Amino acid sequence: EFKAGSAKKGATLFKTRCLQCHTVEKGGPHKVGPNLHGIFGRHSGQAEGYSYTDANIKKNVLWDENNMSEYLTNPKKYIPGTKMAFGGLKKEKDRNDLITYLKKATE
Ligand SMILES: O=S(=O)(O)c1cc2c(O)c(c1)Sc1cc(S(=O)(=O)O)cc(c1O)Sc1cc(S(=O)(=O)O)cc(c1O)Sc1cc(S(=O)(=O)O)cc(c1O)S2
Ligand code: HEC
Ligand SMILES: [Zn+2]
């Protein structure tokens, strides 16, 4: 579960752990993973022009800071069968920092 962290640290975590597959900007393209602009408050599997797995659409999670933290702890345990091949951020502070950044950077 989420507590406010450091967006500055979260930016560095994004650059090293997520940027490979994702962009955050309004104008950012889908890559291996979908662009994440507007992710919070949208249901999973809803970015236009991206081909999601059945598993991601089926989860139908309304993304918020708390379920994002559970997801990022271990994506495959939260959405078994997702094609996001990322083992997770096991340190709670890392998830808090990353999500603090993501809440701002995807607006
Ligand atoms: O809201 S934010 O959480 O993002 C946030 C923004 C700013 C800010 O001061 C703070 C928190 S408070 C703060 C938090 C943390 S910590 O919690 O992350 O440890 C460490 C520090 C720190 O002062 S020290 C520090 C570390 C680094 S770094 O090591 O190179 O990243 C760069 C700068 C810097 O001062 S310079 C620097 C560069 C930029 S930028 O836009 O050019 O990236 C913006 C700012 C800068 O100060 S404003
Ligand atoms: C490539 C090796 C990736 C890494 C590194 C990261 N993500 Fe990812 N992500 C990737 C794919 C292929 C997908 C689609 C999964 C599917 O099953 O269809 C995703 C999906 C997400 C989502 C959900 C998006 C949505 O429902 O619209 C989120 C919120 C997400 N990814 C976040 C995220 C974070 C925060 C990352 C760094 C910790 C990260 N991803 C890395 C591919 C890859
Ligand atoms: Zn400062």
Residue numbers in the entry: -4 to -1, 1 to 103
Quote the study on this structure.
Here, we describe the tsclx4-/Zn-directed assembly of two proteins: cationic α-helical cytochrome c (cyt c) and neutral β-propeller Ralstonia solanacearum lectin (RSL). Sulfonato-thiacalixarene (tsclx4) provides possibilities for protein surface recognition (e.g., lysine encapsulation) while simultaneously supporting a metal site that can bind to other features on the protein. Whereas sulfonato-calixarene (sclx4) consists of phenol monomers linked by methylene bridges, tsclx4 is bridged by sulfur atoms that enable metal coordination. The metal-binding capacity of t-butyl-thiacalixarene has been explored extensively. In each of the model systems, incorporation of the macrocycle–metal complexes contributed to protein assembly and crystal packing.
Co-crystal Form II was obtained at 10 mM zinc acetate and diffracted to 1.3 Å resolution. The structure was solved in space group P212121 with an asymmetric unit comprising one protein chain and one tsclx4. Similar to Form I, tsclx4 was bound to Lys4 and supported a tetranuclear zinc cluster. The fifth zinc ion was also present, but in this case, three phosphate ions were bound. A sixth zinc ion formed coordinate bonds with two of the phosphates and two water molecules. At 1.3 Å resolution, the tsclx4/Zn/phosphate clusters were clear in the electron density map, corroborating the Form I model built at 2.4 Å. Water molecules coordinate each metal ion in the tetranuclear zinc cluster, fulfilling an octahedral coordination sphere. Similar to Form I, a second cyt c was bound to the zinc cluster via His33 and the C-terminal Glu103. In this case, only the side chain of Glu103 coordinated the tetranuclear cluster. In Form 2, with one tsclx4/Zn complex per molecule of cyt c, the packing is denser (solvent content circa 40%) and the largest protein–protein interface is 350 Å2.
